[PDB]
Design a protein around this ligand. Structure first.
Ligand SMILES: *[C@@H]1O[C@H](CO)[C@@H](O)[C@H](O)[C@H]1NC(C)=O
Ligand SMILES: C=CC(=O)N1CCc2ccccc21
Length: 356
């Protein structure tokens, strides 16, 4: 139980219900590497569905019941056996308690039952960590899984700008977005947005942005303009606008993508074609992403799983690819690839896929 909880000293930066947000920290004296990981867990976008989430997913809306410690797993593990990549780094786990894909900047108030402060939580965590050793960092890797991976895309450049403005231009800010690269594609079976389950991701995010006072990266906002900021929650649209180096990890047949597409797994021709087209579209969107790891598996999330080391693309594991990425950020490297996208067209055509 190696990461210790710290509730934010600025108690105006809150989870959904107004309880203080916070972070779990395990310091590594002498390491100048800092890993800040954003937890995922869907989102909520109106009073009704946020109230339901508060009943049965309350740890994602409140810190009242958080434990004092958490065990670092996967990329957050301090054991080289489990984490060949960054086992000696300073480790930070930032719980997702804002239900806003890390985009919100609204407090609970007279007019707001809930606070959606995801973007401000990240900024406040960074601020308070500077006094705890982050001021001496050489690399700050902002990582995250699922909604936390999308949160990396939405926030990495803002962290970079924050540190620049605070007078720390020597900290190299980078992003690692795991399972947060979604497509705004056609559902396999269609449903107009009449309730939570029928509301497709583009519509729910459109509503959420207004409900959360959600913010997106500035260059992306300037491209899509007012009322169209939802586009910036989709990796293939926001990524080209980002200045910080971002490594993208994405299963080609992500289970959350399939869920929002209304796919539930003998597969007949229509569904077969749909699934193959999804993998091909995902592969297409990553063709010009130089640092990426995209295995042909039906799964969801990878970086904080204890067996994250098992999967390989073209014989290279994700910890190796991330190490090669580090070396590239010191022309391609002999035997140390950073762009690893499967080309086989069906889930589990890669033998190293998670077994489930
Ligand atoms: C606390 O956080 C809020 C929201 O980000 C900010 O407006 C305020 O300046 C912060 N106060 C302090 C003392 O850091
Ligand atoms: C796993 C759920 C999730 O996090 N989803 C689903 C679709 C989407 C679009 C943008 C950002 C996040 C998400």
């Amino acid at each position: 139980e190696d990461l210790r909880l710290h509730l934010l000293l600025n108690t105006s930066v809150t989870c959904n219900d107004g309880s203080p947000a916070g972070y779990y920290l395990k310091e590594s004296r002498g390491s100048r590497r800092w890993l800040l990981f954003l937890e995922g867990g869907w989102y909520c976008f109106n009073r009704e569905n946020c109230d339901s989430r508060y009943d049965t997913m309350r740890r994602l809306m409140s810190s009242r019941d958080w434990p004092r410690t958490r065990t670092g797993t996967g990329i957050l593990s301090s054991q080289p056996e489990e984490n060949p990549y960054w086992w000696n780094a300073n480790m930070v786990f930032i719980p997702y308690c804002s239900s806003d894909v890390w985009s919100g900047a609204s407090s609970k108030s007279e007019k707001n039952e809930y606070a959606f402060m995801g973007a401000l939580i990240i900024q406040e965590v960074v601020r308070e960590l500077l006094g705890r050793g982050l001021s001496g960092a050489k690399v700050l890797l902002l990582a995250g899984s699922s909604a936390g991976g999308t949160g990396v895309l939405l926030n990495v450049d803002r962290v970079a700008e924050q540190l620049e403005k605070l007078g720390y231009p020597a900290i190299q800010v980078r992003g690692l977005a795991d399972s947060g690269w979604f497509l705004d594609n056609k559902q396999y079976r269609h449903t107009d947005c009449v309730d939570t389950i029928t509301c497709a991701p583009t519509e729910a995010i459109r509503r959420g942005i207004r409900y959360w006072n959600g913010v997106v990266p500035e260059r992306c906002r300037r491209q899509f303009q007012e009322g169209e900021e939802w586009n910036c929650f989709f990796g293939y649209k926001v990524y080209p606008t980002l200045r910080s180096p971002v490594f993208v990890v994405q299963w080609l047949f992500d289970e959350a993508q399939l869920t929002v597409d209304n796919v539930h797994l003998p597969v007949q021709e229509g569904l077969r074609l749909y699934i193959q087209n999804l993998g091909r579209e995902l592969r297409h969107t990553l063709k010009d992403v130089p640092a990426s790891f995209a295995p042909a598996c039906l799964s969801h999330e990878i970086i904080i799983r204890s067996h994250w080391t098992d999967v390989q693309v073209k014989g290279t594991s994700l910890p190796r690819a991330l190490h090669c990425w580090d070396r590239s950020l010191h022309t391609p490297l002999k035997g140390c690839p950073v762009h690893l996208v499967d080309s086989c067209p069906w889930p589990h055509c890669n033998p190293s896929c998670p077994t489930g």
